[PDB]
Structure formats: C-alpha cells, structure tokens
Amino acid sequence: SGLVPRGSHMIQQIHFYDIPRNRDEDDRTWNPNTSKTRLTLTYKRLPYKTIWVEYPDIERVCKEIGAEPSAFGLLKEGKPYYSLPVIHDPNTGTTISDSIRIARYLDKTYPDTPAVIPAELEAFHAVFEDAFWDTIFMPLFPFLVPAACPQLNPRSEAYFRETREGKFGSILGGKMENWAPTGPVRDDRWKALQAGFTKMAGWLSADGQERPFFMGEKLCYTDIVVGAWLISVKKVFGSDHPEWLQVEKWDGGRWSRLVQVVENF
Amino acid sequence: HMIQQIHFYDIPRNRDEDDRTWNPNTSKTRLTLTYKRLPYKTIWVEYPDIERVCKEIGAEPSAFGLLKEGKPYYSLPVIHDPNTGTTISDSIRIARYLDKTYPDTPAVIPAELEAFHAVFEDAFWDTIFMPLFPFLVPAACPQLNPRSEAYFRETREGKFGSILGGKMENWAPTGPVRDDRWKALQAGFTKMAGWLSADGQERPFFMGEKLCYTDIVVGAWLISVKKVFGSDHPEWLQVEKWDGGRWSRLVQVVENF
Numbered sequence: 429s430g431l432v433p434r435g436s437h438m439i440q441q442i443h444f445y446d447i448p449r450n451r452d453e454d455d456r457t458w459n460p461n462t463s464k465t466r467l468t469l470t471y472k473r474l475p476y477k478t479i480w481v482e483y484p485d486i487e488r489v490c491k492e493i494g495a496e497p498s499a500f501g502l503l504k505e506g507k508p509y510y511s512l513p514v515i516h517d518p519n520t521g522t523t524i525s526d527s528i529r530i531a532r533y534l535d536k537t538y539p540d541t542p543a544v545i546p547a548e549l550e551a552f553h554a555v556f557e558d559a560f561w562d563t564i565f566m567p568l569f570p571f572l573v574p575a576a577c578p579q580l581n582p583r584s585e586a587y588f589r590e591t592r593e594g595k596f597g598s599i600l601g602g603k604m605e606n607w608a609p610t611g612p613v614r615d616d617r618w619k620a621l622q623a624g625f626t627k628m629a630g631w632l633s634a635d636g637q638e639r640p641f642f643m644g645e646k647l648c649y650t651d652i653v654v655g656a657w658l659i660s661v662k663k664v665f666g667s668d669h670p671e672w673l674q675v676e677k678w679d680g681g682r683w684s685r686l687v688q689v690v691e692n693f
Numbered sequence: 694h695m696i697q698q699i700h701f702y703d704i705p706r707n708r709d710e711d712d713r714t715w716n717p718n719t720s721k722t723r724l725t726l727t728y729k730r731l732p733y734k735t736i737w738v739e740y741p742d743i744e745r746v747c748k749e750i751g752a753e754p755s756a757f758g759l760l761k762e763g764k765p766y767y768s769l770p771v772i773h774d775p776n777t778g779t780t781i782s783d784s785i786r787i788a789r790y791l792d793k794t795y796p797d798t799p800a801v802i803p804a805e806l807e808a809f810h811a812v813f814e815d816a817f818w819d820t821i822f823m824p825l826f827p828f829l830v831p832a833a834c835p836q837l838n839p840r841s842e843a844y845f846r847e848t849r850e851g852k853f854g855s856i857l858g859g860k861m862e863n864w865a866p867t868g869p870v871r872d873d874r875w876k877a878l879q880a881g882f883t884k885m886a887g888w889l890s891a892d893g894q895e896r897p898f899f900m901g902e903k904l905c906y907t908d909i910v911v912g913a914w915l916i917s918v919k920k921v922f923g924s925d926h927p928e929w930l931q932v933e934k935w936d937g938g939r940w941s942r943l944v945q946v947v948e949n950f
C-alpha cells in the first residue's frame with residue numbers, strides 16, 4: 429500500500445473555558461456569562477470542547493494562554509479583572525475573552541455561520557447591557573448568587589462567596605443568607621425581579637406586537653444574552669423548582685419560549 | 694407635495710414668539726417634523742390647559758396614572774394633521790404616524806428599531822433624565838408663564854421633591870451639592886457616549902451613518918437644555934465640550950434640519 433493520509437481541513441474544536449460546579453460532567457456548566465459564549469458557539473454550530481477552570485485559577489490560566497482581562501477594577505479598584513468565558517481557537521491561534529468580543533470574533537472568523545452582532549447592533553446592544561444591568565441583573569443577583577454558591581466546588585465556593593459578598597453584600601443585608609431569606613424579604617425582592625422581567629417584556633412588545641426577538645423575526649446576540657441568564661437560573665434552581673416554574677409562566681410565557689429556542693440550538 | 698400645515702401643539706414659556714419653544718418632549722416632535730420637511734404651525738398651550746385642549750381636539754392620553762393613580766394623563770406634544778383628519782399624541786406615536794403617512798420622508802422609527810428604542814428610553818431615563826432633572830427643571834420653572842409656573846412647580850416638586858431635598862431651590866444649590874450633581878450628569882453623558890463608541894469607533898448616530906428617532910430624542914433633550922440655560926451659559930458651554938464634543942456635533946445636526 430503506497431497510501432498515506434492527507435490533512436483534513438475540518439474546523440477543529442474551539443477550546444471553550446468554562447466554570448464547573450460540583451456535579452458530574454454533563455451537568456457541570458451553569459454560569460450565565462459563560463453560557464453566552466456556549467450558546468453563541470452552538471447557535472453557529474461550531475465545534476468546541478470544554479476546559480474547566482475554578483474561579484481562583486482564572487487569572488493564572490488567562491495569563492498562561494494569552495487571554496486579556498475582561499475589564500479593569502470590578503473587584504480591586506486598581507487591578508485588572510480576568511474572567512471567563514474565554515475561547516482559544518486553534519484554527520487561527522487566537523485567544524479571545526469577554527463574551528461580546530468572542531461574538532465579534534466568531535462572526536468575523538466564521539462568516540458563513542449566522543451572524544450575531546452586526547455593526548448596526550453594537551451601540552443599541554451596549555445600551556441594552558446597561559438597561560439590563562439595572563432592571564434584570566441587580567434584582568436577579570440576590571437570587572442567583574446565593575443559589576449557585578453552595579453548588580460550586582469548595583475552592584470556587586470560598587472565592588465566589590468572598591468576592592460577591594465583598595462587592596454587593598453591604599447593600600443587600602450582609603452575608604448571602606440575609607439577601608433574600610424565605611419570607612417577606614424574599615417576597616419583596618421576588619416582586620422586584622418579576623417587575624424587571626415585565627419591563628423587559630415591555631421593550632419587546634413596545635410596538636403593540638409580540639416579536640419573538642429584539643430585531644423582530646431574526647435572533648441576534650442580545651436575545652442570546654437574555655437566554656443565557658435564563659438558562660443559568662434554570663440550571664441552578666432546577667427545572668422542577670417551584671420558583672423556576674413561576675418564571676416559566678411570567679409575561680405570557682415569553683421566557684419559557686426563549687429558553688426553548690436556545691436549548692434547541 | 695402641496696399639503697396644509699400640520700397643527701403642532703407646544704408649551705410656551707415667558708418669552709416672545711421666536712423664543713417661546715423650550716420643552717424637551719415637544720422638541721422631539723418639532724425636530725421630527727423639521728427633519729421630514731413637513732410644514733406646521735404652532736398652537737401654544739399652557740400646562741394646566743393641556744387636558745382640556747386634548748379632549749377638545751380628540752387627542753388620546755399618553756399614559757395612565759403618572760399623576761394620580763386611576764386617571765388618564767394628557768401631555769404634549771400633539772399634532773393634528775388636517776390632511777388626514779388625524780390627531781396623534783405621544784412623540785413616539787407621532788413619529789410612527791409621520792413615517793407611515795409620509796413614506797417619501799426619511800423613516801425615523803422602522804419596525805426593527807422599536808424594541809431597542811424602548812430599551813434606550815429606559816436606559817436614558819436612569820442614565821440622563823434622572824441626573825438632568827435637578828438642573829433642567831429648576832432652570833425651566835421660573836421661565837414659564839405664571840399659570841404654567843404654578844402647575845409645573847407643584848407637580849414636579851410633588852413627584853420628585855422628597856428624594857431631592859424638597860423645594861426646587863434645594864435640588865442643586867450653588868456649592869458642593871450642585872458640584873456633586875453636575876459631576877453625576879457629566880458621568881451619565883459619558884456612559885451614553887460609551888454606548889455609541891462601544892465597538893471602538895465613533896459612529897455619529899446609534900445605527901451608524903444613518904440617523905433615527907433615538908438620535909432625535911437625544912438631540913431634543915440637548916436643545917431643551919441649550920434653550921433653557923442659554924447658548925452662552927457657562928454650564929451649557931461645558932456640555933458642548935463633554936465627550937470630545939459629541940453632543941455639540943449632535944446639536945449641530947438637529948439644528949440644521
């Protein structure tokens with residue numbers, strides 16, 4: 429046999445860096461920000477593999493593989509902040525951090541996949557992230573963060589508790605157990621979360637219709653962001669948790685429907 | 694292209710005709726009309742007469758419960774278009790009406806913008822309107838005609854006075870309180886400029902090269918501040934330099950419609 433192999437030109441698995449929790453492999457993913465990138469990859473039907481990184485190791489892994497910090501000063505007033513998601517794409521040798529920069533890279537590098545963040549979305553999506561921070565993220569924080577924290581592996585649980593209580597504990601009542609304890613405090617915070625999702629639903633129905641996605645019939649990155657936060661809540665709380673089952677009935681079922689979309693990527 | 698003038702309902706202030714307009718919300722519609730090059734005449738309505746004027750001409754209320762819980766809320770701007778016999782309230786609904794009725798004018802609110810512009814109005818509310826309120830409202834109030842001054846002061850102090858120090862004079866008095874609030878306002882404009890520069894470039898309008906209704910909204914708020922404070926006021930002169938001159942450039946655009 430004078431036969432030898434010729435190289436394949438199939439797209440190689442992108443290296444996707446994700447934060448595990450204390451579960452077996454198939455239920456290990458949970459994080460809302462890394463879910464943005466995982467959903468972008470699967471929507472584009474790009475191949476990937478997951479490398480698990482615990483919270484206290486993220487900076488050293490990022491420096492090892494050449495990922496830039498995602499911002500400067502979220503925890504330390506004068507120090508860069510390294511976060512996941514990160515991808516290293518061996519097809520090009522490029523490492524990218526921050527889910528928006530990853531989305532742009534994937535649009536640019538794989539133009540035959542469905543585009544997620546065209547230039548005409550960039551400013552309005554930036555507006556959305558700031559509106560979302562105030563009307564969803566901050567009301568959701570006292571729910572998602574205390575639920576996820578004890579699910580983490582011990583090294584991540586300690587880091588996550590210390591940094592998140594360190595950041596927002598003082599305006600949520602102290603330690604996580606006092607942020608939304610079952611009873612009137614949780615109920616008051618729950619009403620605020622429900623009100624935020626209804627305000628966001630109101631954005632989507634502003635024209636008196638019920639478009640499925642912000643642009644109309646076509647999904648884009650900002651739908652993926654909303655879907656990533658919802659998938660995180662569902663994965664952390666559990667699909668039969670009564671509080672998740674309430675969310676499924678919020679705003680005419682709009683968030684159930686979006687979850688069904690992104691789950692079927 | 695020969696039409697009758699559109700009737701534009703606007704709120705005066707205590708000045709002669711050519712300087713009577715000032716309001717940020719009615720400026721949204723005035724700018725939309727001028728951008729589309731549609732002829733209009735202005736009918737002046739003082740704040741306490743807006744409801745009865747709206748009911749007389751058939752204008753819908755623009756919100757429900759903003760002043761008292763179970764009570765429709767009427768506001769200006771309103772247009773009545775005699776070319777169709779239609780009266781329209783709320784500047785977003787007026788912009789949609791003008792887009793659809795005059796399709797050969799530049800579209801300002803296409804369907805693909807509607808959700809993102811609604812997002813923007815809420816982000817703008819927190820980022821710009823709230824820090825702007827203690828400056829614009831106390832500056833505008835004494836410029837109003839007496840019947841509007843009393844109404845404006847009573848309604849705006851009743852709604853925001855408790856969280857701002859009570860009477861308007863306590864909202865941003867010259868001294869450290871005004872300094873703190875003025876820095877907060879500049880911080881909000883920088884956040885809004887950061888939206889426009891989010892991709893690392895410096896697009897002139899939210900969508901890129903093409904202006905849309907949400908640029909008109911920001912320009913309407915800027916023109917209101919400039920008209921109220923005065924074009925030589927040292928606080929307005931600072932706004933012209935904020936964020937590398939972005940807001941002075943936008944003002945130049947909308948003034949040039």
Ligand SMILES: [Ca+2]
Nearest residue numbers: 662663666667
């Ligand atoms: Ca589950």
